[PDB]
Amino acid sequence: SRIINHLRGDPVYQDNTKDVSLRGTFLRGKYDDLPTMIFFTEACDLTANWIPFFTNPQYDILAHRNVWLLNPRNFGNSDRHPSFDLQEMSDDVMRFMYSQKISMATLGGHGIGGKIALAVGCYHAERVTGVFSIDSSPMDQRYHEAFKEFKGYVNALTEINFKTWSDKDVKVFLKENIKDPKWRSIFTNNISKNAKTQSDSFNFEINYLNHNLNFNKADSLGNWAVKNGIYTGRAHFIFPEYSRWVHLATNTLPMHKVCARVKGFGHDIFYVQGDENPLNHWVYDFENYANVVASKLNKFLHSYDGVHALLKDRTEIGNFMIPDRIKSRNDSKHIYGDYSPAHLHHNWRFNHIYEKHDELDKKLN
Amino acid sequence: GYKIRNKSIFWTRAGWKNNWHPKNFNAPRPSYGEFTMGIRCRNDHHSFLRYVQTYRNMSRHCKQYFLGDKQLEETFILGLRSLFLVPYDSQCLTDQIKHGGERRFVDQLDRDFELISYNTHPYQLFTYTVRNEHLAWKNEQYEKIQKGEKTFEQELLDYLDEQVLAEKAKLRDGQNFSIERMTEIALHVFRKARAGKVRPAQDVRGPDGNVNDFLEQRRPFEHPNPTGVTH
Amino acid sequence: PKIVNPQLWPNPNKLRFADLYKYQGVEMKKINDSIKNYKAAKFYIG
Amino acid sequence: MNPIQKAWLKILEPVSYVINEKMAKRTGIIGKLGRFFAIGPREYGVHPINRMFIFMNRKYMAFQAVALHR
Amino acid sequence: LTQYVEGQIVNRNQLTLKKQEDIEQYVLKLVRGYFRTTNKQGLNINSVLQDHGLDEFDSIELAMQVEEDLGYVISAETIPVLNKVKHFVNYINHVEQFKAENGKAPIA
Numbered sequence: 001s002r003i004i005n006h007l008r009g010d011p012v013y014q015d016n017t018k019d020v021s022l023r024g025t026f027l028r029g030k031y032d033d034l035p036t037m038i039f040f041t042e043a044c045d046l047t048a049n050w051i052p053f054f055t056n057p058q059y060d061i062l063a064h065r066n067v068w069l070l071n072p073r074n075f076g077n078s079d080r081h082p083s084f085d086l087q088e089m090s091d092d093v094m095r096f097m098y099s100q101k102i103s104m105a106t107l108g109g110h111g112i113g114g115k116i117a118l119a120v121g122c123y124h125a126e127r128v129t130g131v132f133s134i135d136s137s138p139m140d141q142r143y144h145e146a147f148k149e150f151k152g153y154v155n156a157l158t159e160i161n162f163k164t165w166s167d168k169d170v171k172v173f174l175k176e177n178i179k180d181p182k183w184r185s186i187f188t189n190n191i192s193k194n195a196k197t198q199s200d201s202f203n204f205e206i207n208y209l210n211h212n213l214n215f216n217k218a219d220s221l222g223n224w225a226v227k228n229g230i231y232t233g234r235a236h237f238i239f240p241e242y243s244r245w246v247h248l249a250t251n252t253l254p255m256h257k258v259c260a261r262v263k264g265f266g267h268d269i270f271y272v273q274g275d276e277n278p279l280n281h282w283v284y285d286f287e288n289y290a291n292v293v294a295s296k297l298n299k300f301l302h303s304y305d306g307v308h309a310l311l312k313d314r315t316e317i318g319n320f321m322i323p324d325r326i327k328s329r330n331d332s333k334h335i336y337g338d339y340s341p342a343h344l345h346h347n348w349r350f351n352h353i354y355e356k357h358d359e360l361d362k363k364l365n
Numbered sequence: 366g367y368k369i370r371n372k373s374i375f376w377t378r379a380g381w382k383n384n385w386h387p388k389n390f391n392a393p394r395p396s397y398g399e400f401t402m403g404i405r406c407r408n409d410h411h412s413f414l415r416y417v418q419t420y421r422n423m424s425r426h427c428k429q430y431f432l433g434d435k436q437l438e439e440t441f442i443l444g445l446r447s448l449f450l451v452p453y454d455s456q457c458l459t460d461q462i463k464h465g466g467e468r469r470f471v472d473q474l475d476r477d478f479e480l481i482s483y484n485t486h487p488y489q490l491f492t493y494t495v496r497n498e499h500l501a502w503k504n505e506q507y508e509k510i511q512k513g514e515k516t517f518e519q520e521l522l523d524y525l526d527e528q529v530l531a532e533k534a535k536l537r538d539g540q541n542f543s544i545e546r547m548t549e550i551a552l553h554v555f556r557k558a559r560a561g562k563v564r565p566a567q568d569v570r571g572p573d574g575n576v577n578d579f580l581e582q583r584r585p586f587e588h589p590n591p592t593g594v595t596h
Numbered sequence: 597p598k599i600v601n602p603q604l605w606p607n608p609n610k611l612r613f614a615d616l617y618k619y620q621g622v623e624m625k626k627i628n629d630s631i632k633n634y635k636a637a638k639f640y641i642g
Numbered sequence: 643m644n645p646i647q648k649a650w651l652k653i654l655e656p657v658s659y660v661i662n663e664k665m666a667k668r669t670g671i672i673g674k675l676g677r678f679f680a681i682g683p684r685e686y687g688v689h690p691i692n693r694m695f696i697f698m699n700r701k702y703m704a705f706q707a708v709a710l711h712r
Numbered sequence: 713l714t715q716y717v718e719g720q721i722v723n724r725n726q727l728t729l730k731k732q733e734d735i736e737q738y739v740l741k742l743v744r745g746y747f748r749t750t751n752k753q754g755l756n757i758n759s760v761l762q763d764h765g766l767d768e769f770d771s772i773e774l775a776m777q778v779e780e781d782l783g784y785v786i787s788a789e790t791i792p793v794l795n796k797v798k799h800f801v802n803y804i805n806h807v808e809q810f811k812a813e814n815g816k817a818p819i820a
């Protein structure tokens with residue numbers, strides 16, 4: 001109703017990658033003015049499934065930030081385009097932030113969604129405060145067993161023809177071809193019947209996706225290319241102890257390799273204590289996994305997100321002075337010294353808070 | 366969040382979580398009168414009364430420096446009992462300790478009293494510091510009340526009582542103003558008041574309501590970085 | 597003693613930025629505690 | 643800050659006026675010279691030697707209490 | 713003979729009961745003054761201090777107060793048997809009789 005507001009639209013196939021618009025759910029915060037958080041769901045996965053996580057009083061995430069559960073191109077209700085270049089998909093978010101008048105946002109993602117979130121910070125860092133990745137890493141996952149199943153299932157989904165196939169023929173096809181219960185349920189709910197019951201189809205572009213995965217090259221979603229670069233801002237990674245997607249042994253190094261400010265395990269990278277279970281990827285379902293992600297998420301949003309690199313926490317804003325590099329300012333008659341870096345308002349561009357407070361400051365003097 | 370995984374963490378050669386009688390080679394063995402000529406032992410049956418007199422001394426010798434503060438004498442007593450009640454409430458089986466837990470604890474409390482007799486026990490110096498900071502804050506409230514001025518604590522109570530009325534005037538569907546709802550209201554005010562101390566409220570914006578305070582700042586000419594270089 | 601300020605930049609407000617003005621006092625406060633010991637030891641040393 | 647620094651300030655009161663009020667705010671090399679030799683409180687004025695004694699005094703004194711309390 | 717009371721030095725006063733009725737009233741006033749005592753009006757001559765929220769360590773604080781008000785020197789061997797109001801009353805009498813017959817205070 002009010003707290004939950006998801007804009008409604010129809011997907012549009014686009015020939016130009018720049019004329020792509022993103023659509024998703026918006027969760028209003030408890031308080032009037034709060035920074036915004038943009039969260040990307042797993043590929044082919046529903047945004048609604050994350051609502052109980054972000055709408056739980058025990059976690060109270062909306063008390064911190066407004067949440068935009070946004071779908072990337074070719075997913076959900078967003079526009080469709082064959083290219084999956086993270087640079088192109090990142091520009092889509094920048095236009096969405098512009099159309100929605102968002103100066104800078106906190107980015108999050110689950111699995112492959114985490115890659116999309118981190119790519120935006122890699123391509124647009126000046127407008128991203130932080131990144132929170134869940135069971136993902138900026139890494140090539142083409143040869144991970146978890147990805148192969150997803151890559152394999154999507155290929156099986158290309159065999160069904162809704163026009164000829166009946167409703168029962170589909171249900172039998174999924175149970176036999178899809179073994180994972182969660183993926184099966186996710187895919188079933190992604191099937192929709194267009195107006196006038198003309199025919200049933202998948203909400204996501206099955207053709208463009210299978211080609212990306214089946215080709216299994218740099219543009220594949222499982223792959224993380226060197227072209228994507230480095231993320232300069234705050235980044236926190238949380239994944240299960242026994243996870244098929246992120247192996248604790250070596251899959252943590254890409255974080256140090258790609259994220260410059262990542263300190264390491266125990267500070268910006270954590271693992272949730274758990275057993276071996278293929279369903280641990282979906283932390284929002286299990287309270288034990290979710291409670292830790294929420295606590296760590298609230299800690300990242302409250303103390304670490306949107307904090308200058310050389311500062312430890314948000315507590316140091318206004319009391320810790322950073323050294324200055326010589327000959328870094330235009331003024332020639334400037335005595336170089338330590339300074340507290342400037343932290344700006346989350347939407348200072350599309351509001352006039354600075355112009356307003358300047359007047360109030362004059363009234364004091 | 367994180368639980369110990371090793372199941373044998375509390376295992377000892379003497380059993381599970383045994384911190385009263387650790388296993389050692391020279392184990393206690395009995396003595397027989399008919400076969401025993403002489404013996405050298407320090408164990409006695411005087412630990413009970415020493416446990417009583419030690420309490421009376423540690424209590425009476427600490428009150429010498431309380432200046433008749435009745436509220437402090439009663440608080441100190443509760444803390445003194447917590448120190449003597451450790452053997453009675455601990456997981457450690459104090460009645461099964463190696464060579465007598467009674468003598469062990471009594472001899473330990475005697476070392477604490479020796480420091481108390483000199484007024485050098487860290488609990489004493491900690492009690493003086495804690496109490497002086499409390500009275501300085503209570504006297505500040507008294508001085509502000511005698512002047513008819515309003516205390517920062519009463520301003521919060523009055524600001525919270527009126528907010529409860531505003532929140533319950535719209536809570537008509539339900540009528541259970543839970544303690545949870547009352548709490549988040551108070552914490553929200555505390556967080557804004559907490560940030561107000563370092564950045565007071567100049568205008569209607571309120572405490573810590575100026576964005577310009579968070580722009581680039583510099584140390585004042587009269588107080589530079591004394592500990593390190595600046596550039 | 598008063599220190600001459602070139603006034604090249606405005607100093608932060610002590611109320612809004614108080615921690616910046618504290619270090620100077622605590623440094624002398626340390627020395628005063630040491631002096632109390634020097635004076636108290638006049639009879640022992642003497 | 644310490645008493646010895648305060649003694650310098652009383653002696654350098656007129657020197658502080660010349661360098662800070664007049665020179666520091668000029669332009670050119672005369673300004674760079676005044677702003678460089680500006681008089682006031684010391685940046686990084688701490689004395690590590692004095693701080694070193696304090697640490698070793700406290701560390702060695704705690705050893706005395708253990709060795710002497712027998 | 714002086715003590716601090718709320719930061720002020722006050723001269724301490726000692727009592728001399730020498731009467732059964734004055735003892736029962738003093739002990740009750742004493743036990744009712746202790747901040748740990750429960751059911752202060754339910755306290756009578758036959759009240760077990762354990763039944764009013766008092767343990768062995770609280771009986772010590774009470775004995776410590778008897779020395780303050782009466783000037784007695786109570787030994788550690790006598791305190792742990794004071795677990796009822798009746799016990800304080802009978803002990804106080806035994807001390808008054810000892811000093812009235814032996815001319816000295818009991819062994820401390």
Ligand SMILES: COC1=C(OC)C(=O)C(C/C=C(\C)CC/C=C(\C)CC/C=C(\C)CC/C=C(\C)CC/C=C(\C)CC/C=C(\C)CC/C=C(/C)CCC=C(C)C)=C(C)C1=O
Nearest residue numbers: 646691692694695696697698699700701702703704705706
């Ligand atoms: C008693 O208990 C004990 C301790 O306390 C618990 C310990 O800490 C310790 C450990 C010891 C230490 C931690 C101290 C360590 C010190 C060491 C190793 C030596 C330190 C040496 C220096 C810092 C170099 C000093 C060099 C100079 C003084 C020469 C330069 C100064 C000059 C020439 C000025 C002239 C000085 C004089 C005429 C002396 C008169 C004295 C004054 C204060 C006059 C001052 C005058 C002015 C104008 C400031 C022990 C052993 C101990 O027993």
